[PDB]
């Protein structure tokens, strides 16, 4: 049908995958461009369709800015162009607690695709005020109950390792990647997309 593979690696599985991008000034404009490029490389190595891999892209500061929903029926090349054009916020704070609440109540409020795995790829560079973490474990526990796998990727020395370890504790498929900087994302990309692809089923209809 519509649009052939760009690379030899091509994940043809039943997967709802959500990209959550740290919008804080812990990343420079140039470092944020590197993060989006990683997101666009990932997207090019997936079979994007309502039948195969669904993608969502959210940028988070003290609130969530959704650019693509799982259900947005558009051309892969259109979706990838949108992801490449996500704006730099350079915000004071990036709230893991807020973007996980958004993912729980706004993206995964109901499970359309019980046949699919569901993955939150939480791309973290920063540490939220301790006043904003009141309900953090609650929302991660709410995602574990909706069968959403949370994969925290800590980027850089300011990423909150306490929270990454906490997320891993709350459930066993919740598995973390700890990176020294954005430049490591491209090193780590093939291992990461292979790991994400293997957590998903090949058409179990």
């Amino acid at each position, epitope marked *: 049908i519509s649009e*052939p*593979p760009l690379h*030899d*690696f*091509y994940c*043809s599985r039943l997967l709802d995958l959500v990209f959550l991008l740290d919008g804080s000034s812990r990343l420079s404009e140039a470092e944020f461009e590197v993060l989006k490029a990683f997101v666009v490389d990932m997207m090019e190595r997936l079979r994007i369709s309502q039948k195969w891999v669904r993608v969502a892209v959210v940028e988070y500061h003290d609130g969530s800015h959704a650019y693509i929903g799982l259900k947005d029926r558009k051309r892969p090349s259109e979706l990838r162009r949108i992801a490449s054009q996500v704006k730099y916020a350079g915000s004071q704070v990036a709230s893991t607690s807020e973007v996980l609440k958004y993912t729980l109540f706004q993206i995964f409020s109901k499970i359309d695709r019980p046949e699919a795995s569901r993955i939150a790829l939480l791309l973290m560079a920063s540490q939220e005020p301790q006043r904003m973490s009141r309900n953090f474990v609650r929302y991660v526990q709410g995602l574990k109950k909706k069968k959403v796998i949370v994969i925290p990727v800590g980027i850089g020395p300011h990423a909150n390792l306490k929270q990454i370890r906490l997320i891993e504790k709350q459930a066993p498929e919740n598995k973390a990647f700890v990176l020294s900087s954005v430049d490591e994302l491209e090193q780590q990309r093939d291992e990461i997309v292979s790991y994400l692809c293997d957590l998903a089923p090949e058409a179990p209809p």
Partner: nanobody, 128 residues
Framework: EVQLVESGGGLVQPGGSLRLSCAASGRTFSYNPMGWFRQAPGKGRELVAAISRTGGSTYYPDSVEGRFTISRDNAKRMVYLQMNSLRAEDTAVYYC?????????????????????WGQGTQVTVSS
């Protein structure tokens, strides 16, 4: 899961030319790495040509380098075997196959056990 249909076989003069086509269909088809195998009278299945998912990489045994070009067109879900300067020993049934082991990795596959889906076969006879 994956259905493969070969066409375009027949009789040719030695030193003649022939293009084989394979039409791939089905829900689970994901532009898998493909391979052309043959069974000649009294002989096992031989891999003669293999191609990555994108077509950027190819494998042929040294025995047949220069006589076979495998290619593919992913828009049409086709794979091809261009046969050139044909010999007596190239008489055989030619099978189109697809790798179903770890399909997500579209690199060229040489191990025959990684080929999982198989067509019905097309006869090529090189004679007078």
């Amino acid at each position: 899961e994956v259905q493969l249909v070969e066409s375009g076989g027949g009789l040719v003069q030695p030193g003649g030319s022939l293009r084989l086509s394979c039409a791939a269909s089905g829900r689970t088809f994901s532009y898998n790495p493909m391979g052309w195998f043959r069974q000649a009278p009294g002989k096992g299945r031989e891999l003669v040509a293999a191609i990555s998912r994108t077509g950027g990489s190819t494998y042929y045994p040294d025995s047949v380098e220069g006589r076979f070009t495998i290619s593919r067109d992913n828009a049409k879900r086709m794979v091809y075997l261009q046969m050139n300067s044909l010999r007596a020993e190239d008489t055989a049934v030619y099978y189109c196959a697809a790798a179903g082991v770890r399909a997500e990795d579209g690199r060229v596959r040489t191990l025959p056990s990684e080929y999982t889906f198989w067509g019905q076969g097309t006869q090529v006879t090189v004679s007078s």
